Write a protein that binds this ligand. Structure first.
Ligand SMILES: Nc1ncnc2c1ncn2[C@@H]1O[C@H](COP(=O)(O)OP(=O)(O)OP(=O)(O)O)[C@@H](O)[C@H]1O
Ligand SMILES: Nc1ncnc2c1ncn2[C@@H]1O[C@H](COP(=O)(O)OP(=O)(O)OP(=O)(O)O)[C@@H](O)[C@H]1O
Ligand SMILES: OC[C@H]1O[C@H](O[C@H]2O[C@H](CO)[C@@H](O)[C@H](O)[C@H]2O)[C@H](O)[C@@H](O)[C@@H]1O
Lengths: 384, 437, 270, 282, 384
């Protein structure tokens, strides 16, 4: 079945979950996102039935979730600590759920062999936790969820203690086997990239409030507010400081007019003169082969790339751009996520670009595909 | 059965076990004497009982004790006088044929708090392997040590030199052959210098003490001496004389028949072999006794102790063991009867004979088998009649340690100083004052 | 190369520094009445008779028994009261256990004899003059802190988040408890029980005063009084044999428990 | 909150009651006994009030000297004990090979029944018989003659305690990061100066409690004196003086007073280590 | 000064360095890289003198430097732990190296103030390490090195235990600090992206020995072996199974007649036959707006989408190759980092690609920047 909640609130001595409402369709591999110390582990504890509820009466599909025994919820979960049993072999650990459920030995034996072969860990089922890698241990904890065939699955950042090279393999495993399971399945993480890497739909929260829910490309293209826009993409969309002229910007950098339909869409509620745009660094290029239709709106203007780095097919370049308009609560708490100054930006420019460190060079921008955001209101004026 | 524990020093337990068995036969199984076996250490034995007493251990029954501390045990009510025994006999029994000095010694404030059972004094126990006759004067003892040491002969003479009661007792004997005493006959006043002549006798004894502390060819290791080592010195022939209890005779005869007595290797004799029985214990026929006895007389003689003055008979300090029923005792009347049966004449016989040590019934002086069993008994009787005795004093134990403390500093024996020093100490002892050293 | 052999030499010197005097004791138990330091290395005649001589001493055999039994009862009581008070480290009340549990370690250091006097006076008043509880209660009082402290060291490891894993799994709280909590804790208990037994059994200052009966005398005090009823003042190879049979128990304990017991004492440096 | 708080109180109460009962009444009965001047040999002869009873003992030179020799014994013992304790803990930590067997070697002498070691140290120093004693010239016998025997007391007893100090001190060497030592040894300090300047401050709290225990446990000693001398050569410690009262004097007032004075005497040194040096438990 | 070594080995029960010989000029910001266990952190131990010499000799300027003069080697190094002494304030900790160097106290004070103004640190000089943030503590560990103004600065994994945002921001600090100092500086890492952030020269090594060493673009463009070709970049080249024809190469689909010079370069050696193709995933696209000269050589074939995600400028699309012929010791030991399977690959196609998961789609290749490798020797035929 689906799983759903409404009005969900939890209140420590201070409001780590607040009024939340949702449902997840079955087989959905939903990705859950927020800063560390958002309501993540608390809502997980509430979904486990262990946490107390200030308000709400959720449904684990076919039962009142706020109103029933926790083991009787018939779910599974894996902790970021990898809770594990040093007084057991891996085989005995894999049997822990089955033996908890009084499962007959021959069935239990077939079940552990199956999940151990869904892992690679069938090579060492006789080993105890004293002789496993952290990744082998993590997978084993994954198996400790998997073998029970629950109604639903929860993942409290399981990838976290693997290195990146392990973590990408884990992301693929989680995906394929959640697909192979077809269960309602949830994962929570602090980084944006894993939520880009996997999950049908995505949900994002701050201070116990659910901020947005949607497909990750809608989040990638119409994030409702500057903070939830900034929390996604590691080369975040450059919030170049700006002020409105009723035709575009009173440009501190560039020279941009706004295209007439996008302008008359903005004009419907253009109350703030203080505004900002999400300059995605991938918009920003050296004009190296720009002939034809790309000439019409290139709006190219100079900055002096502080540094450039040949990461791949893009050789990212850092630059700075002075101005006024990029001041807000959303931007300040984005800078509390990590600080970088006020004018400092990057272009995701093509690595064949002629740019060498320590020169002023003219950066072109595909300005027809910029967003617009209320600097005063803290919200995306272009879309949600 | 109804056990009566005979708590005693463990040293003679075999004798006590065999006689207790003979008594348990005689009791017809009504109640059973059993040995409770106290430390070889005197004080320890004496003060281990104070623990069991203070806790009122219900297993505490019949306690042997040394005559001295009886006043304290009576004053504290730890045993009951012979008048209170519900058998009625016990007072009369302890009165009947008991020798006078021991009977008087049990009479705390004239009340017999306990019954005497055995007694001892130290002999001028002389080897005839070198010396012609024993020195009957303590200065004569220095002279014989000097002579033998000049001869390079068996020059040592054996004495109770360590810091425990034996040194104090020896001192008390020396002091009272010099006419001196430690406290008044009531205990109501120190008397070591209550006359300047008592002071003179005290420092005269102190001069004697310092002189025997350094006498020519004495025991080089006398600093910690006790009867074990003291006998060892004489029977090895390192000494020519022992100042020791009557136990010297039977233990020497046993060791002669072990072959260890250097001048008396009676182990060579087939009548004396096997007289040492399966438990190594000399158990003679009249022939085996007379053979060993004659061979001992050929090379040893017991005598009265060396006098503190030329031709003055030594007032040797009397010693002995009394038996008392502890006020814990459940079978108290039965215990009184058990005390009576250990007092019986065949027990007195057995303890003098198999036990080898002086019983207290006077009538045995008239027995040729007792005169055989203790040839010294008449010297014992005379010295007992002459004896010095320690003052009947509840604080005696503490007093004696206070006295002992003064002796400790052997290196400096200032007669005039140490006599005043110990006078202060025994005053503080009579006063009951101070955290005890 | 050479630095390792040099270290091994330092190690051998430590093992000698430990093994020597107890070896001098054990070997001295076998002397043919030599009494003369001849048995420095490989004694002339290994005189077995001391073994049967001490075994014939039924006062000693009862004192041994008394010591073992009073050891077992005190470790049991001390563990069961101590553990369920080393617990309440999962709890942490407003008052502040940690700040006040200071006394526990302070009274572990307390001078026994200072309370031995009033204790003995009380036992002189009450019926418990030198019955078993007259040891057991005082002994428990000096067992108590090290028991609390050492169980608290395991319980500072005790990962209470495994209860969240258990609750998330299908097992009932009791079903999980009896198949994880006890399995994790048991080495911590048994080593603490052995430890407090060892620390109890070595005690003498109280026992050598608050006791005298054959019913309550213990192996240490009995061995100390083996000067009595020795044949001819020979508490020598006999008392040495007594020490040997007391200490074999310690050896056969520690040679098994070594790795575990150091973890207990260090509170974590296994 | 109050649910768990009341639960924790009920859970801790049995041990708290036990430790209280087995201490409070004893100390009370002692203080009551002091100035209630009385003797077990004088069973009805109780003074109903004894002011300055303890001041008799406090005035006694024999007490004050007994007090002094205990301290003289302890602090010397503690000093060499500490020096050996760290030396052992260092080796036991940094071993090239044998760390398990060395752990066995460390624990065995600690785990001993203390009277056994005491008798070992009592014979090795008896003349003729003693495997150590015979290496002296004649007339020596170091068990005798007061001060020489105290050297044997210290030797005997620190050999008995030292592994426990090493175990307790190894907590310092265990917590310190090896790369912290590598960083330190990757600087301008020669090994001894580097090791001391870096390790000592990290060792501080373990060092404090080790000294706190070793001080008190040495101070309330008895066995390694009594089971090696009778206190007889004026070798009498505080403890043997304390015991002799219940052994021989039977003045329960005196026995109390010395017991109480013993309690104050630990109370001050505990208060110093705790408050002045700042020591506290793990 | 400059860094040099020759014939360097240290040996442990075996050779953690295989007689290494190399140098880097004075004032540089060089980087060293390899997999865990390759001896890399070890080499730093040998440079510290805290690792001894089996063979070889070294200098940092001057000559023959021993292992009994770590403090006389004029070097400093923040450890992989960022550990620092809690027995002090930050001020005392930063002074500790200089005061141990017998610096006069007022100069010591001025020098720590200089450093504490250079770094983010003057504000917490009075705090102890027991009351610092992980970032300020990491900064403090930098301080504890740079206070010595050493003849070399040696960054042993000082920026890896932070989060991603902290790590890149610290990289900008590290840059500006090495720029501000101009002193010889080294960094070492278990990943390529650290050196991709900066490295004035870059070195990569395996099993105690150097495998390539030079400028980061040559390293990126012309790998010396399959190992280094796999180590560079996050989307590693899809080393597809192939065979050598006297006209080019038979790949599993879209196989090619090779350009004549590259072909006659391939023909310059007689032995090669077993060969594999360097499918660098960013060099791959949809044809849907490919209006240019590349249409002469699209070499396209239809490939199945195992998954696709529009993760940024690119749709990363997972697929798998056909046939077999890409199995080797270098491929296997390079595959030790993650679950690479047997033919599993990705294309980094531009995200405007009108494509979904599960379907099979014609995929176009920039063969103008394709490349080739020799499968048994395990190195590029295409470049060096
Ligand atoms: N028992 C509690 N008492 C008081 N505050 C709490 C308690 N538990 C959690 N909080 C606070 O509520 C917030 C929510 O924590 P939650 O467990 O939901 O996520 P987290 O574990 O802190 O971070 P993440 O889940 O992202 O790893 C936290 O920031 C925390 O400070
Ligand atoms: N002193 C040593 N004795 C024996 N082997 C060692 C020693 N030091 C390192 N090794 C070997 O090196 C390996 C550890 O890797 P290394 O020494 O490169 O440190 P590292 O931290 O793994 O390096 P990096 O972090 O750069 O990967 C081990 O597998 C071990 O066999
Ligand atoms: O005769 C054997 C007894 O010797 C010790 O007692 C004697 O020696 C004591 C002095 O050390 C005297 O006080 C005592 O009067 C003597 O009888 C020993 O204490 C006894 O147990 C022996 O029976």
């Amino acid at each position: 079945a689906e799983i759903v909640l409404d009005r969900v609130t939890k209140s420590y001595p201070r409001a780590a979950v607040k009024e939340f409402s949702m449902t997840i369709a079955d087989g959905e591999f939903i990705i859950l996102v927020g800063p560390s110390g958002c309501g993540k582990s608390t809502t997980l504890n509430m979904i486990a039935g262990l946490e107390e509820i200030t308000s709400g009466e959720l449904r684990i599909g076919g039962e009142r979730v706020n109103e029933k025994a926790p083991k009787d919820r018939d779910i599974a979960m894996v902790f970021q600590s990898y809770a594990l049993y040093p007084h057991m072999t891996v085989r005995q650990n894999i049997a822990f759920p089955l033996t908890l459920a009084k499962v007959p030995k021959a069935e239990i034996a077939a079940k552990v062999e199956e999940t151990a072969k869904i892992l690679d860990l069938s090579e060492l089922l006789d080993r105890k936790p004293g002789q496993l890698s952290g990744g082998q241990r993590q997978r084993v904890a994954m198996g400790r969820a998997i073998v029970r065939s629950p109604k639903a699955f929860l993942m409290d950042q399981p990838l976290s203690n693997l290195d990146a090279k392990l973590r990408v393999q884990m992301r693929a495993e989680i995906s394929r086997l959640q697909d192979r399971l077809g269960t309602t399945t949830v994962y929570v993480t602090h980084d944006q990239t894993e939520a880009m890497t996997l999950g049908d739909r995505v949900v994002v929260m701050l201070a116990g409030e659910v901020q947005q829910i949607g497909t990750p490309d809608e989040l990638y293209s119409s994030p409702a507010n500057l903070f939830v826009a900034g929390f996604i993409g590691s080369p975040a969309m450059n919030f170049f400081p700006a002020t409105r002229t009723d035709v575009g910007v009173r440009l501190p950098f560039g020279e941009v007019t706004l295209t007439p339909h996008m302008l008359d869409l903005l004009d419907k509620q253009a109350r703030p003169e203080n505004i900002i745009v999400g300059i995605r660094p991938e918009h920003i290029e050296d004009s190296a082969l720009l002939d034809g239709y790309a000439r019409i709106r290139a709006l190219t203007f100079s900055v002096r790339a502080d540094i450039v780095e040949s990461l791949g097919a893009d050789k990212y370049v850092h630059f700075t751009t002075e101005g006024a308009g990029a001041e807000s609560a959303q931007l300040a708490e984005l800078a509390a996520d990590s600080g970088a100054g006020t004018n400092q930006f990057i272009a995701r420019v093509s690595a064949d670009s002629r740019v060498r460190t320590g020169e002023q060079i003219e950066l072109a921008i595909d300005t027809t595909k910029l967003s617009i955001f209320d600097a005063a209101t803290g919200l995306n004026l272009t879309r949600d | 059965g109804i056990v009566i524990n005979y708590y005693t020093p463990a040293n003679e337990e075999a004798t006590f076990k065999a006689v207790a068995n003979r008594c348990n036969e005689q009791l017809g199984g009504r109640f059973q004497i059993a040995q409770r076996n106290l430390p070889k250490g005197a004080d320890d034995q004496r003060l281990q009982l104070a623990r069991r007493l203070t806790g009122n251990d219900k297993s505490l029954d019949v306690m042997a004790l040394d005559v001295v501390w009886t006043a304290e045990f009576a004053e504290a009510g730890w045993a009951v006088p012979l008048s209170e025994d519900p058998a009625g006999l016990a007072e009369a029994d302890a009165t009947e044929n008991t020798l006078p000095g021991p009977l008087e010694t049990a009479r705390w404030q004239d009340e017999l708090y306990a019954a005497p059972i055995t007694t001892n004094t130290q002999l001028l126990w002389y080897r005839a392997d070198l010396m012609p006759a024993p020195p009957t004067t303590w200065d004569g003892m220095l002279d014989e040590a000097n002579r033998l040491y000049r001869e390079g002969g068996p020059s040592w003479i054996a004495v109770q030199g360590k810091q425990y009661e034996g040194m104090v007792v020896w001192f008390n004997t020396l002091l009272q052959s010099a006419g001196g005493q430690v406290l008044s006959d009531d205990g109501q006043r120190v008397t070591l210098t209550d006359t300047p002549e008592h002071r003179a006798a005290t420092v005269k004894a102190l001069r004697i003490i310092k002189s025997v502390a350094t006498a020519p060819g004495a025991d080089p290791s006398i600093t910690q001496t006790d009867e074990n080592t003291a006998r060892l010195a004489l029977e090895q022939g390192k000494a020519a004389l022992e100042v020791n209890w009557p136990y010297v005779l039977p233990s020497l005869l046993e060791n002669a028949v072990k072959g260890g007595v250097s001048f008396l290797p009676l182990d060579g004799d087939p009548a004396l072999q096997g007289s040492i029985n399966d438990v190594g214990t000399f158990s003679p026929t009249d022939e085996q006794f007379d053979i060993a006895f004659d061979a001992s007389k050929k090379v040893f003689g017991f005598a009265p102790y060396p006098g503190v003055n030329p031709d003055e008979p030594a007032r040797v300090t009397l010693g002995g063991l009394n038996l008392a029923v502890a006020s814990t005792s459940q079978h108290k009347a039965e215990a009184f009867e058990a005390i009576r049966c250990l007092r019986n004449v065949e027990n007195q016989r057995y303890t003098s004979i198999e036990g080898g040590l002086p019983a207290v019934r006077t009538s045995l002086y008239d027995d040729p088998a007792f005169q055989k069993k203790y040839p010294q008994y008449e010297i014992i009787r005379q010295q007992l009649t002459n004896a010095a005795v320690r003052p009947a004093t509840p604080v005696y134990q503490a007093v004696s340690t206070r006295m002992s403390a003064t002796l400790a500093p052997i290196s400096d024996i200032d007669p005039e100083r140490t006599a005043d020093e110990l006078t202060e100490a025994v005053q503080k002892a009579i006063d009951g004052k101070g955290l005890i050293p | 190369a050479r630095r390792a052999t040099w270290w091994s030499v330092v190690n051998i010197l430590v093992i000698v520094y430990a093994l020597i005097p107890v070896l001098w004791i054990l070997s001295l138990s076998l002397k043919p009445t030599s009494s003369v330091k001849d048995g420095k290395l490989i004694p002339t005649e290994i005189t077995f008779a001391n073994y049967k001589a001490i075994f014939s001493g039924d006062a000693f055999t009862s004192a041994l028994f008394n010591s073992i039994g009073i050891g077992l009862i005190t470790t049991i009581i001390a563990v069961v009261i101590g553990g369920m008070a080393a617990y309440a480290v999962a709890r942490l009340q407003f008052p502040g256990k940690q700040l006040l549990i200071g006394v526990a370690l302070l009274i572990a250091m307390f001078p026994h004899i200072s309370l031995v006097t009033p204790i003995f006076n009380m036992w002189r008043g009450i019926g418990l003059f030198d019955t078993w509880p007259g040891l057991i209660i005082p002994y428990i009082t000096f067992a108590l802190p090290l028991a609390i402290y050492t169980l608290s060291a395991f319980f500072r490891e005790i990962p209470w988040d495994l209860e969240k894993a258990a609750k998330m799994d299908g097992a009932t709280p009791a079903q999980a408890f009896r198949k994880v909590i006890a399995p994790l804790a048991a080495p911590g208990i048994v080593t603490a029980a052995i430890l407090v037994f060892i620390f109890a059994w070595n005690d003498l200052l109280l026992a050598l005063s608050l006791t005298a009966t054959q019913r309550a005398i213990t192996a240490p005090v009995a061995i100390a009084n083996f000067t009595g009823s020795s044949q001819f003042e020979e508490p020598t190879g006999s008392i040495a044999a007594g020490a040997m049979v007391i200490t074999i128990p310690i050896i056969i304990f520690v040679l098994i428990f070594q790795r575990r017991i150091v973890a207990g004492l260090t509170s974590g440096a296994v | 909150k109050k649910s768990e708080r009341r639960l924790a109180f009920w859970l801790i109460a049995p041990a708290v009651l036990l430790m209280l009962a087995v201490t409070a009444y004893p100390i009370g009965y002692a203080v009551w006994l002091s100035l209630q001047r009385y003797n077990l040999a004088e069973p009805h002869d109780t003074e109903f009030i004894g002011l300055a009873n303890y001041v008799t003992v406090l005035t006694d030179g024999y007490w004050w000297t007994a007090f002094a020799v205990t301290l003289g014994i302890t602090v010397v013992s503690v000093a060499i004990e500490f020096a050996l304790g760290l030396a052992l803990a260092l080796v036991m930590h940094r071993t090239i090979f044998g760390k398990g067997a060395v752990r066995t070697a460390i624990l065995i002498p600690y785990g001993i029944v203390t009277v056994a070691a005491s008798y070992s140290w009592y014979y090795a120093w008896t003349p003729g018989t003693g495997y150590l004693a015979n290496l002296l010239p004649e007339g020596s016998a170091p068990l005798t003659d007061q001060l020489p025997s105290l050297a044997i007391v210290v030797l005997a007893e620190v050999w008995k305690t030292t592994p426990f100090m090493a175990l307790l001190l190894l907590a310092g060497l265990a917590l310190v990061p090896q790369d912290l030592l590598n960083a330190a040894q990757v600087d301008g300090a020669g090994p001894w100066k580097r090791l001391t300047k870096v390790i000592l401050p990290m060792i501080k709290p373990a060092i404090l409690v080790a000294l706190l225990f070793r001080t008190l446990d040495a101070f309330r000693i008895f066995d390694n004196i009594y089971i090696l001398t009778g206190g007889s050569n004026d070798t009498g410690s505080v403890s043997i003086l304390g015991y002799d009262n219940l052994f021989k004097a039977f003045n329960v007032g005196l026995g109390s007073a010395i017991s109480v004075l013993i309690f104050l005497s630990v109370a001050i040194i505990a208060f110093i280590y705790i408050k002045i040096f700042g020591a506290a438990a793990p």
